[PDB]
Design a protein around this ligand. Structure first.
Ligand SMILES: *O[C@H]1[C@@H](O)[C@H](n2cnc3c(=O)[nH]c(N)nc32)O[C@@H]1COP(=O)(O)OP(=O)(O)OP(=O)(O)O
Ligand SMILES: *O[C@H]1[C@@H](O)[C@H](n2cnc3c(=O)[nH]c(N)nc32)O[C@@H]1COP(=O)(O)OP(=O)(O)OP(=O)(O)O
Ligand SMILES: [Mg+2]
Lengths: 206, 203
RNA sequence: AAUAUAAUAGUGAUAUUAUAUUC
RNA sequence: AAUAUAAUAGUGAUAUUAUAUUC
């Protein structure tokens, strides 16, 4: 199947990424939603841990800063990949999860501002997420396959393999949240269940 | 002896107590400074702020944390006033500085950062006011006189000095070795555990 | 803490991430 | 967690804080 159309979500997240990158580039001197950007941001995050000043407290604040920025950048990247392989709602839920966990741990001066900058684009992001015209063609085709196969055979035990746990939760919520897939009763199998996954069990697709 | 005749320190810190209870005076929808009466009052107030409720629970948490912090800083300021009544103003200042050091160690809270900021605004004026030799309290002067005379008559004198609080223990501990005239003294500390031939002349 | 697999840069030993497992 | 002492508030049972101790 083809990749998605146009991504408004990716545009917004990209702007946030280059803004965060601007915050990080103030101190120190390849596209978004790719594995390369992940390797890069990792090596960069490690490079900021070598940063040294005669003043150790200011150094502490700066290294903490760069760690925070690189972290949020990483999370943004992951969110983009998730939106590529799943719904936009899954990506936004990933980001919301992240920022929620950030809030629970207590707010640094900087994390509060990053959260603040996310909050203003949140309404637009959700507005894009509720837009039916933007749906993923991959999930279109998957839904089509499931529909056909369960139409021909009302009793079908399916097993769906995905790369990451994020996609497991994402596709679980996608199946539970799709009116067309209502005949499905999904279940989860991951690393650190099976008796209810049978044909007589509660789970059609695993 | 006589109480110290003029408080500059309390004059300015009553302004921080006033500004803190003014900040408290924003969120409330609702007595002398440097006394136990104010301590009782601020404790009862602190306990009164915990039972206030709102339909929004998170907002409630925010303002309750705020009120708790405000009353806490108020209490610490009061403590500083008392400490400086019974000891050097440097000791009270250092008490507050230790307090805010701990606060900084806790983490960055919007309220705490604010309060610490307003405190740091007055820090220069404050340290200006306790570095002056003119402001030394009559009680410590008289104590210094007693110790001086008694050790002049008998240099082998062993002394024991009883004070009410541990804060004052640290206070006089620093006061003795921070005093050039008392240089013959070798202070030591005796307190509780919980939250002649040797060389210690005074305990 | 160790092990395996996959993707990714490197000619390669490797390295990063993902996934899973074991002690 | 319990106990004692001191100051403060209250007519008082008490209450707050301070100090110390014990289990
Ligand atoms: O250096 C490791 C290691 O010494 C020890 N450790 C943690 N889990 C294991 C284990 O399963 N088997 C062995 N032999 N050693 C183990 O902990 C150190 C690192 O701590 P971590 O934070 O990485 O471990 P943690 O539990 O927090 O995470 P996870 O590995 O279980 O996912
Ligand atoms: O309710 C108390 C109590 O159950 C328990 N506790 C703590 N210390 C003791 C003790 O010496 N003897 C008894 N019987 N029970 C004790 O802890 C609860 C309260 O916790 P705290 O925060 O007050 O205890 P902490 O160690 O933090 O302070 P402190 O004991 O030094 O004064
Ligand atoms: Mg994924």
């Amino acid at each position: 199947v083809e990749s998605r159309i146009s991504d408004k979500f990716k545009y917004i997240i990209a702007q946030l990424m280059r803004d965060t990158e601007s915050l990080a580039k103030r101190i120190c001197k390849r596209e978004f939603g790719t594995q390369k950007y992940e390797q890069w941001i990792v090596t960069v995050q490690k490079a900021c841990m070598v940063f040294q000043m005669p003043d150790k407290d200011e150094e502490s604040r700066i290294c903490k800063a760069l760690f925070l920025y690189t972290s949020h950048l990483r999370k943004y990247n992951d969110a983009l990949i998730i939106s590529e392989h799943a719904r936009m709602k899954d990506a936004l839920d990933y980001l919301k999860d992240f920022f929620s966990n950030v809030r629970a741990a207590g707010f640094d001066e900087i994390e509060q501002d990053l959260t603040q900058r996310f909050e203003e684009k949140l309404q637009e992001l959700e507005s894009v997420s509720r837009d039916p015209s933007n749906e993923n063609p991959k999930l279109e085709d998957l839904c089509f396959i499931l529909q056909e196969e369960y139409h021909l055979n009302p009793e079908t035990i399916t097993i769906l393999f995905v790369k990451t746990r994020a996609l497991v939760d994402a596709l679980k919520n996608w199946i539970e949240g799709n009116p067309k897939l209502s005949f499905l009763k999904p279940g989860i199998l991951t690393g650190r269940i099976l008796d209810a996954f049978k044909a007589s069990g509660d789970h059609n697709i695993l | 002896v006589e109480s110290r005749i003029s408080d500059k320190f309390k004059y300015i810190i009553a302004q921080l107590m006033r500004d803190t209870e003014s900040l408290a005076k924003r969120i409330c929808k609702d007595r002398e400074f440097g006394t136990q009466k104010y301590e009782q009052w601020i404790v009862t107030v602190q306990k009164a702020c915990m039972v206030f409720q709102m339909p929004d629970k998170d907002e409630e948490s925010r303002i309750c944390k705020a009120l708790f912090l405000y009353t806490s800083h108020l209490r610490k300021y009061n403590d500083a006033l008392i400490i400086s009544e019974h000891a050097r103003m440097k000791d009270a200042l250092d008490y507050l500085k230790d307090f805010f050091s701990n606060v900084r160690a806790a983490g960055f809270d919007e309220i705490e950062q604010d309060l610490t900021q307003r405190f740091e605004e007055k820090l220069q004026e404050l340290e200006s006011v306790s570095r002056d030799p003119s402001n030394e309290n009559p009680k410590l002067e008289d104590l210094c006189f007693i110790l001086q005379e008694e050790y002049h008559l008998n240099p082998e004198t062993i002394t024991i000095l009883f004070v009410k609080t541990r804060a004052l223990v640290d206070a006089l501990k620093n006061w003795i070795e921070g005093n050039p005239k008392l240089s013959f003294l070798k202070p030591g500390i005796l307190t509780g555990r919980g939250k002649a031939s040797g060389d210690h002349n005074i305990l």
